[PDB]
């Protein structure tokens, strides 16, 4: 799109992230096997749910804090996330662990968004998250084979214990 063909990786990301938030919003592993994202989407979903939730487990208090600051209510919610998104990557550290954290937070919001019956915004939320991400770090994703490298580096579990 804007620069080259980053939309290829975007297709997967948009769906993979959505599947994660949809699964987190329900709290049940009901999300159907995404075929749109391909095999990488399957591998990523496994990782995304385990690692994404892990981010919440150790610092949920932080997500709860930001959740109360995020003016999520109207369509402006997608702009609200963009506001924090731009600031989160201001120091330039795009390290893989940070991306998973962005999704982690967005999904945490999606969970409460589901309980407040504002699911009409959770759907475009993942889309807003993935779009901005891919348009600003198209090269970054490519460097780690997109979700393929993400899964390879995060599919493994802790070895230290905790």
């Amino acid at each position: 799109g804007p620069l080259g063909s980053e939309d290829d990786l975007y297709r997967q990301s948009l769906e993979i992230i959505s599947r994660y938030l949809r699964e987190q919003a329900t709290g049940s592993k009901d999300s159907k096997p995404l075929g749109e994202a391909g095999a990488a989407g399957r591998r990523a979903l496994e990782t995304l749910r385990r690692v994404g939730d892990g981010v919440q487990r150790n610092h949920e208090t932080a997500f709860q804090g930001m959740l109360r600051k995020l003016d999520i209510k109207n369509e402006g919610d997608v702009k609200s996330f963009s506001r924090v998104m731009v600031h989160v990557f201001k120091d330039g550290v795009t390290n893989w662990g940070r991306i998973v954290t962005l999704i982690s937070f967005g999904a945490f919001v999606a969970k409460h968004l589901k309980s407040v019956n504002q699911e009409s915004f959770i759907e475009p939320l993942a889309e807003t998250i993935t779009d901005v991400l891919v348009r600003t770090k198209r090269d970054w994703l490519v460097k780690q084979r997109g979700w393929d490298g993400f899964v390879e580096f995060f599919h493994v579990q802790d070895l230290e214990g905790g």
Partner: peptide, 27 residues
């Protein structure tokens, strides 16, 4: 509004801590 500075600051650090842990976790 501007108080989001401290909020996003956390999100950044939480992301770094994940990458940090998983990095040594592997190698």
């Amino acid at each position: 509004p501007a108080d989001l500075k401290d909020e996003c600051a956390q999100l950044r650090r939480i992301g770094d801590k994940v990458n940090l842990r998983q990095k040594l976790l592997n190698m």
